[PDB]
Design a protein around this ligand. Structure first.
Ligand SMILES: O=[N+]([O-])c1ccc([N+](=O)[O-])c(O[C@@H]2OC[C@@H](O)[C@H](O)[C@H]2O)c1
Ligand SMILES: O=[N+]([O-])c1ccc([N+](=O)[O-])c(O[C@@H]2OC[C@@H](O)[C@H](O)[C@H]2O)c1
Lengths: 501, 501, 501, 501
């Protein structure tokens, strides 16, 4: 493919793609492994927010009753989220808070979800729930101050359209929960941004009904949130895996555009859309998350998602996760960008590569994005998504690039099936479920992207880049001006080194 | 050619090769860059000793006078060595102390050497020198304890046979020095291992005459020390470089062997030989040091060195160095295993690869060493030294390794003219003298060994490795037993992941 | 009163006191907070062993089924203990392993203990319990090597004599469990030191019977294990506290003495006694743990416990704990030496003070220990336990100490009701449950022990220390030799500095 | 003396006091010790700028020549200052650059200053000098960007009115150097802030003459810079100390006010004034620097200096220094707020305590500053300077603060002759010149300010605080509102803890 890149760009590539990221339940943020991962993530990708479950679930331990006199009185315990939210700010990432699930002692019923058993029943008392919300949100304000907390976003629950996350998928009782929550939030401070309905795909009439509910009853909404996944249901389970086929990335972008339109035609036309969960597969034990295909796939979404949505949050930044029990093996199919022992998966590198793009959009299509940075250098992320089985499937992309700076340093980073892929190498080691330190160390060496560099002189003010992508490669290409200093090394002559010319 | 690696080995590959390592002057150990460098070097190569000049030179500031009442009296400032040596022991490296150069205020003349102007004249008074030595040795014992200082070694002066390092290259006067120093040391504790004559090559009758001076006069010697290089004197200079031709590595090994023999024919037939400086070139501004050639070259030394010499200390661990002024550019020909910004140079990777070898020497010729680890894995370092100008020059090596382990994990790391070579990429950047942090980080990325993994079945309890070395490649190959766990993943099927088979 | 310290000591004060230390369950070692706390504890007190609950309980996640080829087969997930033990060894602590509690899937009934719901029923199948032990112990050996694991200890279950921890406190069923476990361990390696009965107090015929059981059936036992507390059952509960009266520490030492005597009467008279949990109170929400009284109390135990027992393991090193839910406030009555946010509690400082003592036991009574270090210096720890309510209550102590020195530097460190006491200060702050970072730093500053130094000249080779201990003071006194260097500062006169004399 | 602190104050206490700080020559910035110190300084006191010598002196290595052909051509080496200025920015501190001294290779003459021998002669060629500056400033802008460099300040030379620092203290020649420098700076970018004359006191007609010179010859000046000290010429020397009397703190403030007047009376009446060096003693071996008096003395300067000068830069932040050779002992009278081994001296605490103050000035006089912070809390630094010899000499300050809050947590911090004073304890240890690590740790533990806390109820809507300062005591007091949480601890009763009430 021959893509002629212009010197100038009308558009700006926005940073929506790294606005927010996902995470396993907040209680897992107490784990050193977790925070190692979060550190890595925030050093290499700069997420602004993080979005998880469990804030009000009982391992974090906020909501209790507590026998005083002979009445059960509510007790709010911030010991853990203080630590959690602190560890977050310390890593320059803010909570996209998600109020859920139901504390056990506030639950109206038994139903739970996940291995860690988040209670998914409504509050036995909405006054108690509201007071939870007021307490938490007020607690946050005390700890972090109002100006900090105002930058946070507060989602109400999670996937209420699903029977697993909300008793009977009750639209009406969710809307009651939304309204008590949204009102509770604004009552603490009116700038605080509360939103919903946190629905998973398959039920976008919920967004419309949610926005009709909010307009009709004058319920505050500051954003719509929605999840996006492209995996069909499991066509094969093992004791530790769900294998699922996938719709192409276009399916996710159409999901985004569709929900943007629902918002345009609603009484709240100006509302931000945050996709608070996205990946390929929605199961934390689907091995696709460990693969290069995941990288290549998710790159398209990084490219284009931001046209439709104010943010879209990769579920998750890390394999530290337990919705489906403790990981049974190093590469076990989890959502994480980072695997246990801080081994980036290929998808991590995809974010790393997008994080090198500039603001100025020179060219974008369905398999690349090409940007100018403020120093005049170019940054391109290209990907070769291939959802079909088979080998080779190399795609050459020819890039013609405007460069006035007579010489250029090109640095290219590739992750694919061979490179930046610890999953492949893990396989070769015997798929050790519980690898030794040495094996982890090799895995990490191997998980680094392949780097290639060159100096190229630009003939006619043009650089012609032949970029050969292999199956499911995501690659970062940067073209820097070379300010050559060779001429200051007077007499320099590598021909005077043994073996060199 | 075809190498049939025996299943078993009588001989043990010893750790002589990393007993000790070279350093820029001890004063420079105060530099944060220096410690960063030592720390990397101690994490990836665990050297036991570090040997450098400048212990008694005036930047470290031990020796002074000091008009106290009405008298110029000696003052021993240990502020800097306490901190230097402390920093050494904190990194699990002990000093191979070298008593030099002449404190300015103890100097008998003004001849200095180097940019930092180490004085190279005999002491104006040997009684004061003696006391310096007693004071230093004593102070060390007081700070670190007698048990610890006894593990240290003590060389006396540096290169006294060279006019640059010692006034008139006075053999007789350097023997006076050695005697005063050796006795000084021993008078403090008889078990302190003192030695000399730390000579450079070209005048090895100094070993003979030194050890007869020691026999005649019964001067304690506990080892012989000697430098060893293979570079002729510079035949080109720039304002910045020396370019030297190198003798091949056999010349260094014949140097080792011939000195060993000279010691065996001496009155002290059994003394240890510590080669206290070695590289290819002896100039810290010979770009050869930053190349792959350097690594391939030194790899043979690591392999055989221990045959003839109890230790051999690579000059140096780091480009933190000043003999020829402050590095005028990132890669500037410095002795260092590690370049500024902690960019491993190819020779670094050589040591690191030797660090992965086992005790059991299975096979060794002049281009490889093969070893069994105590868990039964093989570790083999192969190098392809090519001193002749020109491209290509690839060696095909065929390694036939035994192991009744069925399945095998091979990890291969290569560093050559393309991989693990930040010098070649520095040049592509336009030889930035003073690189941006971004350039540095690229350089670091690129300085990493290229890793290649595979799983192979064994046929007939044998692995057959067809190994292709590029020019001046050093490569580590490890063959580990795969204890394969895949069978525990019942239902595991990569064929159920999108794109995978 | 008056105490004349012998210049020489017959006996050695041993390190039994810091052989082992308690931890809240192993699952919590995943917390970054837990490890912060351990690093701290390992730098200031060097514990060799760490004994905790929950190795096999389900948060750590080892034991699962796992439906494979039509059966429920065991699935040993090592993800979490690998990470846990790793981190233990990285901080130079080994597991005093305690095989408990029942994995939910291995359990025969529903009885749990604690908020974390450790199952306390017999295995539904003792063969599978055997295979669990074999799996875990084997796994450890496969990861750490046999020479490492052989240094560990293995306690079977916890407090089988209590109904809360073991169905019916069934003695015969516990012996069955112990036999199965002890043989399973030994079946893996005969060096693996296994032991019980891990009983709480009140019921020491369990030792007698347990050992009778083992003699009769030739069941391997390598040590006896026992808990030791001195608190009566809670007389007052709030929703967050258990308040308890305490027996004096002689009571604990009598427990030690008495259980050792039951071992000498038994068929295994020479068996090690490891007291694997002691504290004052056995409630993790008794505020007593946070006080200076706890420190002063336990210092007597540190002083004398080793006379009777091979180890005694302070429950716990850290307030990272959850047996009674998540800490409801910074100081919440947790067992920890270390409070959250790495705030040392008074008791932490007691260990620290014992960590400064020498081998040579010069003098000891029930309020002090005095030791000679090998450099010749004295180290004394003194405590003024005062269990009575009220203020004042200051012990005077006249130490008369031989010193072979003449000029002496004394460093006293004190923690008591004023200093080294973040609890008192936390109360002044308004008892914030969830203190801000600022408050926490203040608490940490204030948690440090008060230091008083002084130079004293000996008279007639003796130092006469008049020491006043406030109520529940634990104080460390070190008397070190001064090698005065002031004479070398010729002309030094502080009287030539503004204001100084 | 009683002070009725008003609730609100019209004026702001400015942060001029910590705008900038002094340092040893930039070359020492390369030392690990130095950066430990800077780290600490920047974690506890937040300095915006750092100002020292040697930028162009040859240890930093920027100016060389460099025989190319037969010509000596200038060569600029940025290897060191890149690493220095990076290390600066990483620690959030910016260079208050100072162009000096003369590179040997550029020097017109042989006169040097200091042990390290900065050349203090005019350049041999002013074009060469100019080119140096352009080179240096262009480099900065290249590496860090114009926006960043525009925030830096550029002083020309140091103390040109002193014969030691400038050949013949030649005024007219300094103005030539100034003009050439300032013109060189402004030619690179006009917004770069260039300034001088960097004079030491006792010669202020130079500021007048300088500003007339610049006014008349239209030479750019953006700031006046000046040094301020109060020590008289030494009255005793030892081989290692200068001992000096000190004019009182008013003398310095009057120096500040006098120079502000000369500036107002000048052709540039609104120029900022930066005191680029102040301490009490101008010698780096005056033990007053090490003392508590230093602290209490510098406290009035921090309180008030800002009225008269835009900045005032305490020479120096650390003892890493060599103007008078390597430190001969731990506390050796160096300028540093931080002693070697990162042990803060009392003075460091004064900056720390001042760094606790709010912006809103409630009350100030010559012994205290009392401020309100944005959360309504009070912060006051009180000082009791006593320049006379003698014991005791305390000082009661009675602050009467309005608070209608019911209750108050008070946190006080004291460094005086007893507390926060490691010099005092170092003396008790026998003035170890080169202390053991154990000794250093005691020293550090002792270098911490004494902390006293209490809770105080309000009476009459007011708090009456009696603050006893002892000799040369600086003390920080913070009064915060207590939000008492005790009522939530329902049933709490410390009375139910052994020994407590
Ligand atoms: O160019 N020199 O000053 C020089 C020439 C030859 C030798 N040599 O034959 O050993 C030499 O000596 C040492 O090696 C290089 C230098 O960096 C070391 O400090 C010297 O000991 C130097
Ligand atoms: O210690 N000296 O050689 C010296 C004496 C007098 C002054 N002075 O009058 O200002 C002085 O100069 C400056 O201040 C102290 C020094 O450390 C700085 O480098 C100079 O700027 C030094």
């Amino acid at each position: 493919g021959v893509v002629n890149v212009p010197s100038n760009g009308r558009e700006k590539f926005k940073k929506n793609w790294k606005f927010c990221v996902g995470t396993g339940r907040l209680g897992l943020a107490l784990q050193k492994e977790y925070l190692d991962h979060l550190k890595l993530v925030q050093e290499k990708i700069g997420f602004r927010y993080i979005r998880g479950h469990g804030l009000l679930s009982d391992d974090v331990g906020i909501y209790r009753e507590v026998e005083i006199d002979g009445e059960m009185k509510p007790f709010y315990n911030f010991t853990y989220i203080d630590r959690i939210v602190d560890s977050y700010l310390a890593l320059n990432i803010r909570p996209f808070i998600e109020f859920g699930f139901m504390p056990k002692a506030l639950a109206s019923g038994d139903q739970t979800v996940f291995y860690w058993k988040g209670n998914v029943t409504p509050p036995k008392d909405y006054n108690k729930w509201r007071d939870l919300i007021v307490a938490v949100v007020s607690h946050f304000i005390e700890r972090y101050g109002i100006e900090e907390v105002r930058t946070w976003l507060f989602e109400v629950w999670n996937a209420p359209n699903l029977v697993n996350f909300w008793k009977d998928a009750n639209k009406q009782e969710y809307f009651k929960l939304y309204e008590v929550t949204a009102r509770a939030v604004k009552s603490v401070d009116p700038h605080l941004q509360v939103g919903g309905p946190a629905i998973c795909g398959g039920s976008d009439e919920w967004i419309t009904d949610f926005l009709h509910f909010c307009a009709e009853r004058r319920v505050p909404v500051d954003f719509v949130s929605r999840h996006a996944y492209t995996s069909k249901a499991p066509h094969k389970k093992t004791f530790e895996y769900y294998y699922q086929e996938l719709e192409p990335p276009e399916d996710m972008l159409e999901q985004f555009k569709t929900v943007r339109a629902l918002i345009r035609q609603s009484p709240f036309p100006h509302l931000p859309l945050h996709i608070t969960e996205y990946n390929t597969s929605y199961s934390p034990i689907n091995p696709v998350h460990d693969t290069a295909l995941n990288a290549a796939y998710i790159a398209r979404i990084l490219s284009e998602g931001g046209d439709y949505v104010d943010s879209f949050s990769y579920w998750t930044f890390s394999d530290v996760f337990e919705e489906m029990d403790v990981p049974k093996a190093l590469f076990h199919g989890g959502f994480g960008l980072v695997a246990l022992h801080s081994i980036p998966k290929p998808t991590f590198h995809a974010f790393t590569f997008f994080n090198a793009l500039g603001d100025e959009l020179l060219y974008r299509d369905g398999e690349m994005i090409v940007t100018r940075r403020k120093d005049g250098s170019i940054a391109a992320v290209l990907w070769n998504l291939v959802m079909e089985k088979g080998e080779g499937l190399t795609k050459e992309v020819q890039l013609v690039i405007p460069v006035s700076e007579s010489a250029v340093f090109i640095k290219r980073q590739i992750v694919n099936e061979q490179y930046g892929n610890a999953w492949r190498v893990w396989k070769q080691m015997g798929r050790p479920r519980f690898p030794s330190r040495q094996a982890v160390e090799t895995l990490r060496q191997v998980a680094q992207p392949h780097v290639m560099t060159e100096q190229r002189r630009a003939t006619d003010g043009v650089i012609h880049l032949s970029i050969v992508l292999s199956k499911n490669e995501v690659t970062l290409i940067e073209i820097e001006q070379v300010r050559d200093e060779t001429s200051t090394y007077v007499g320099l002559d590598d021909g005077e080194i043994t073996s060199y010319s």
